[PDB]
Amino acid sequence: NIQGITKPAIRRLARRGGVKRISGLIYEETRGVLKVFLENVIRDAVTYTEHAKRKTVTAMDVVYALKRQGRTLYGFG
Amino acid sequence: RKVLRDNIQGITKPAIRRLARRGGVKRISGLIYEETRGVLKVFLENVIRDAVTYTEHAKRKTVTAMDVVYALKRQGRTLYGFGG
Amino acid sequence: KTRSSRAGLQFPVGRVHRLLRKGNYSERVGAGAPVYLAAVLEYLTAEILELAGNAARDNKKTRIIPRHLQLAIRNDEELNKLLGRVTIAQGGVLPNIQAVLLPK
Amino acid sequence: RAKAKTRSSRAGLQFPVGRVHRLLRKGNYSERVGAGAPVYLAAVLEYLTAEILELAGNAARDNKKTRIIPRHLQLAIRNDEELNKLLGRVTIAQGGVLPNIQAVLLPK
Amino acid sequence: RKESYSIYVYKVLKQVHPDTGISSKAMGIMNSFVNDIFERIAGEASRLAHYNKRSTITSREIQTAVRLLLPGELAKHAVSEGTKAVTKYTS
Amino acid sequence: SRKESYSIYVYKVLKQVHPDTGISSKAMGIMNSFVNDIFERIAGEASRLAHYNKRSTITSREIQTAVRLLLPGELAKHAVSEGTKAVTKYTS
Amino acid sequence: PHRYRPGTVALREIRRYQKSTELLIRKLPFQRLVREIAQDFKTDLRFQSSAVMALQEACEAYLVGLFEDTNLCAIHAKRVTIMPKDIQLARRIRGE
Amino acid sequence: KKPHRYRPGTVALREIRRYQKSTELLIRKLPFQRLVREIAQDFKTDLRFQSSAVMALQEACEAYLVGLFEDTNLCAIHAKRVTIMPKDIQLARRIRGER
DNA sequence: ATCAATATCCACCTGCAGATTCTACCAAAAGTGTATTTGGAAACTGCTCCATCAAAAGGCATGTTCAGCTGAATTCAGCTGAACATGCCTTTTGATGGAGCAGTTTCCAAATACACTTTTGGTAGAATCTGCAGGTGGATATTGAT
DNA sequence: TCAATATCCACCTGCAGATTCTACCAAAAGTGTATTTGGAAACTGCTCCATCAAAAGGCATGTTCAGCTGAATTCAGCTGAACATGCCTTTTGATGGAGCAGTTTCCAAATACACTTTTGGTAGAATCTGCAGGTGGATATTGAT
Ligand SMILES: [Cl-]
Ligand SMILES: [Cl-]
Ligand SMILES: [Cl-]
Ligand SMILES: [Cl-]
Ligand SMILES: [Mn+2]
Ligand SMILES: [Mn+2]
Ligand SMILES: [Mn+2]
Ligand SMILES: [Mn+2]
Ligand SMILES: [Mn+2]
Ligand SMILES: [Mn+2]
Ligand SMILES: [Mn+2]
Ligand SMILES: [Mn+2]
Ligand SMILES: [Mn+2]
Ligand SMILES: [Mn+2]
């Protein structure tokens, strides 16, 4: 569902990162990396959600999952 | 007492070479030794500054191994072996 | 009289004390601790809002938005270190293009 | 009075359930501590210790020694994926590193 | 019901920049920031008191925690304003 | 001047997994450090878990969720197994 | 007929997207990706819209940062084109 | 009979094997101790150290430099060199978040 | 290095949709006053370790020479990725119900706290035990050759 | 293949360090009672999900070719290898004696608890400012000299 992360969107992300020329193999690699990231984050968020005997993952569950991976996110308290 | 000066130079070129070999380094630029001394001094100052802060908080004059272990841990570099 | 009034602070000393008591940080909480903690939090908030207002002015605007917070934090040595692993939603990045990527 | 039976014995554990309970209580984690929490926790600490001591003992045998030293603990941890991540930011004093030479450094 | 620091951040904003406002998203970022620094400081102070077998977190723990968590000039000015507030409060 | 440690328990587990094998005191300090570190990690996660859900009690189920959050994969699976077994045996 | 030289449009885009803050992935493809990955943990879960948005902010900040590090790795090798081996070096050194 | 001589790098590779096989501290003890005390005295005069505090610092420092030299070496190899240079160290520390 | 042509950028503008403030009420939080307890600071003191110094052995740092091989610079081409035009389809935007979650509230059975007493596992130190630190010597492996 | 050099890998034994034992006692266990809390039952709004549609604007595709990456080639100078020399680290040991820990006493500072006053949170109504998109150049770039 990964392929729905378009080549143009990845180019946009690369441009915000200051990248001027992109090899053709970056896109699949980028998707793989994004996928690992997402699984790790979501795996923890849902764990928090199940501990609270909820069926809705909340913004605070995602903030806790991020934080515990050393990636504090501001704006969603 | 006795005035301690320039002890950064006691990290010899051969000792830095040994550390790099343990890191798998085969060839070393001649400018690496001074850079290594700079980076080691920054690292050490950060660790020792926090260790001393713990020592001052406990109103002690002796840095203990636990002060260094706490300073390390809070800098994200946990050290095993020096508890108790 | 609120404790915040007696300390000369805008941040809420009583709330900081309740939060310390309710956080399982220690069994007892001294009287000076929430005053000291509220003062520090206010000072840091003032520093950041100072810089963010200056940045929002540089861009000719009146409402501080997340972008000015990101600009304020990343262009300052010590705050950028304090918030080193923090992501500011809607903040973007600092404009920075490696010199070797430019023509000429 | 009833003959005293340790909680670790009734849990079937080697690690001390009572001490783990005291440590939770005096560590200011929550105001109350359920009776099952120190048992589960001691069981987990014992399991992980067993895992690490298993792998470290094998490493000490491979190098023809009978007493485990820090080097065997380091070899056990860095050669096992899951322990290596669990202890990813941990320094084993006197542990050394794993032998590894990037291929491009070797002669033709 | 649902707490935040918005009113206080707003007061501090009108202190340093009388004419400037702040969006609700920027205010949310400020709220997350205040909660983050609070947790960092309180948690360090908690570890400090445990290390020294003490059951009370006093201003002296908050100060040491600030010295450990803040960089350089920020630590100096934070210790300064904390001492200032505590002395003003004691009267 | 009494000083507690996990040494005796680490040693009992050593005699369990490698009966004829010993351990040097530096390695014993490493194992003590490891036990204390994982204790703090788990206890801290469980404390936060209870705090997030406005609960005052840390139960075995907070310890369980903490185990699932901090341990990798098969390690977490087998640890959950041994923790459940101990709690169920202790209750009866 | 008018045509820009290779890289002129690239630098225009770098400037435009480094000056801005809008999300760069489209929302619905991302929401579907999030929901699939979640379904592989516990099906029939629900998401606050703000939870999906927090995930998107986290992911984009992560990839943009990773691309800064990758770009420096490429330039280190005296290139201007990022390649998978640059991404891999950045993640190996980051400890990922 | 021309005197024996190893080709450049053969001894370096032997040293890599010998030191990656061992765990002894690689900096001399007394110079490291003086460096620690000098840095500490410039923070609070007349401090004292438990010997194990100094040894914990030395273990910490050596592990850190060995880890950073692994990262530096990968940076050099990435640039198709075999000689680590300051720009490799600087790249490694920028990416680690250390600068 | 200029030049005119072409394409995208960027101040400047204005009304109004939507975001930010006025309005007003109110649980819960914060403050107050009084009573009672207690953690830890102060002042001692014994006694570990810590600092310092010494000798002396010999390991290792230092300083030098010099050649191999590496990094740096330069040239060239083939192939890859940028730009662009084109037109199709995925996303955005908005709506629509309404199923089914969160979030509350009450109330007892079950759980946990905590003081006192009894018991026993855990520690410190003494008393045994024993791998392995080093030291030695040949086998093997590798290296670089002329 | 050979000479030189280094590493590998058993063998040996005493003793420094580990293991075992012993006895004291601190803390866990047992017990009894007081206090807190979790969940079964019963609610009630209110968020999300499912579903449908129009249509906007973003993406996929295919061609051309600019220029980047990697290979090839050359050279000079730096860094590795080898050696002598002798400094200073290591080791072992002793000595004062600083200052950790261990104790004791006792208040300044904390908790407890009843009661009162204030305020931050909340939701709607009533006002203000960034944003849609336009315009109008204006700024930068490009091929051509
Ligand atoms: Cl206080
Ligand atoms: Cl429990
Ligand atoms: Cl690649
Ligand atoms: Cl360099
Ligand atoms: Mn000095
Ligand atoms: Mn009372
Ligand atoms: Mn007392
Ligand atoms: Mn080369
Ligand atoms: Mn060509
Ligand atoms: Mn007994
Ligand atoms: Mn040996
Ligand atoms: Mn007793
Ligand atoms: Mn009000
Ligand atoms: Mn606009």
Author numbering:
A (entry chain B): 25 to 101
B (entry chain F): 19 to 102
C (entry chain G): 15 to 118
D (entry chain C): 11 to 118
E (entry chain H): 33 to 123
F (entry chain D): 32 to 123
G (entry chain A): 38 to 133
H (entry chain E): 36 to 134
Cite, word for word, the article reporting this structure.
The basic structural unit of chromatin is the nucleosome, which is composed of the nucleosome core particle (NCP) and linker DNAs.
To study the structural features of the H2A.B NCP, we reconstituted the NCP with recombinant human histones, H2A.B, H2B, H3, and H4, and obtained its crystals. This implied that, during the crystallization processes, the nucleosomal H2A.B may be exchanged with the canonical H2A without assistance from additional factors. These results indicated that the H2A.B-H2B dimer in the NCP spontaneously exchanges with the canonical H2A-H2B dimer. In the canonical NCP, the H2A C-terminal residues (P109 and I111), which are not conserved in H2A.B, directly interact with the H3 residues (L48, I51, and Q55). In the present study, we found that the nucleosomal H2A.B-H2B dimer efficiently exchanges with the canonical H2A-H2B dimer, probably by forming an intermediate “open conformation” NCP structure. Interestingly, the H2A.B-specific C-terminal tail segment is important for the adoption of the open conformation and the H2A.B-H2B exchange in the NCP.
